[PDB]
């Protein structure tokens, strides 16, 4: 039943999710803000994300940034990532099926089944990964994006980015309610902003009390400022992804979000086809044979058939009960025969 259920679009969503987080990582590490650790003035980096829509189109910084971002995304082990993701997914489905199956007891037999699935997937893993990298070799060189793919990436980026924003804002508001009033966290935020500017100094590597704020309160204020800046950047990039300037494909360096999402979807789908063939069919064919062979060999080699019987308390007493009755019957038969051979 499960094998009839699984198929290939499930693998597509599975890969597209791992690659979605890969996109967020690459994009965030190349474009967005870095954390606040101390209370010293940070020198403002020359190029900033707020001035990206209004930037010189032939900017070596933004060009190099989006280019190293994409090359970093493509020259990753996408073959091995797809292979291991599909592997963990298939194995997990087998483990759940095992949970609902009759092998909830007998953890040895259960482990034999699980290890059978694991060894099959492990056997096929390399061929799937290498084949996926070879099949992706043309899209590593030129992941040329068609206007329709660009639109798809456009619609996906809005959702991915806003989900990242909602996680950020919910964490901010919970921080407010934890520290106390929104206004009080606004006070510690104003203090950390002041110390981040020249307005006030603290001279502390680990400041305990400054302006009347505790050591924990300072940490909560820095955390609040980082969350704020990341929220503003996120909303700004959402507005940019919904902007009219990102609707067209010609502004690829101006819209890194949409471009990186398009590359992710493409790589996911072409990798997914080879993955389903090379790996999924191989699992459906090898798995039943491996289960039967390993279970029989386990029972007879390890003597775990007798333990399989001993394990369930009900069948234990059953297999025990029969012989004692047989012995008493044979005893009575012997006495009854004794009386017949000797009348008295």
């Amino acid at each position: 039943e499960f094998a009839s259920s699984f198929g290939r679009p499930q693998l597509q969503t599975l890969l597209k999710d791992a690659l979605d987080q890969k996109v967020l990582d690459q994009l965030a590490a190349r474009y967005w803000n870095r954390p606040i650790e101390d209370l010293s003035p940070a020198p403002r980096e020359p190029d900033n994300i707020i001035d990206l829509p209004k930037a010189d189109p032939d900017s070596p910084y933004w060009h190099r940034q989006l280019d190293t971002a994409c090359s970093g995304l493509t020259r990753l082990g996408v073959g091995r990532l797809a292979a291991t993701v599909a592997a963990s997914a298939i194995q997990q489905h087998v483990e759940k099926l095992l949970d609902k199956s009759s092998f909830a007891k007998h953890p040895s037999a259960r482990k034999v089944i699980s290890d059978a699935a694991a060894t099959v997937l492990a056997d096929r893993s390399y061929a799937t990964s290498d084949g996926i990298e070879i099949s992706l070799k043309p899209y590593k060189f030129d992941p040329d994006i068609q206007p329709n793919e660009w639109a798809q990436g456009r619609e996906h980026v809005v959702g991915v980015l806003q989900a990242e924003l909602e996680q950020c804002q919910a964490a901010m508001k919970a921080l407010e309610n934890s520290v106390g009033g929104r206004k009080k966290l606004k006070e510690v935020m104003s203090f950390v902003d002041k110390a981040r500017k020249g307005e006030i100094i603290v001279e502390g590597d680990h400041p305990s009390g400054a302006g009347g704020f505790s050591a924990a309160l300072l940490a909560r204020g820095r955390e609040a400022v980082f969350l704020r800046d990341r929220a503003d950047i996120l909303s700004l990039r959402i507005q940019a992804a919904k902007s009219r300037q990102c609707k067209t494909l010609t502004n690829k360096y101006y819209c890194p979000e949409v471009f990186l999402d398009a590359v992710a979807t493409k790589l996911a789908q072409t990798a997914v086809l080879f993955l389903n063939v090379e790996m999924l069919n191989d699992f459906y064919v090898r798995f039943p044979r491996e289960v039967e062979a390993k279970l029989h060999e386990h029972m007879h080699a390890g003597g775990g058939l007798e333990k399989f019987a001993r394990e369930d308390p009900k069948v234990r007493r059953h297999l025990d009960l029969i012989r004692r009755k047989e012995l008493l019957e044979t005893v009575l038969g012997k006495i009854e025969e004794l009386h017949r051979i000797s009348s008295g």
Binding site: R75, L76, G77, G79, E133, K137, K140
Partner: peptide, 9 residues
């Protein structure tokens, strides 16, 4: 050899 395959083809 693997890094030689994935990153420099």
């Amino acid at each position: 050899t693997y890094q030689f395959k994935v990153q420099y083809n």
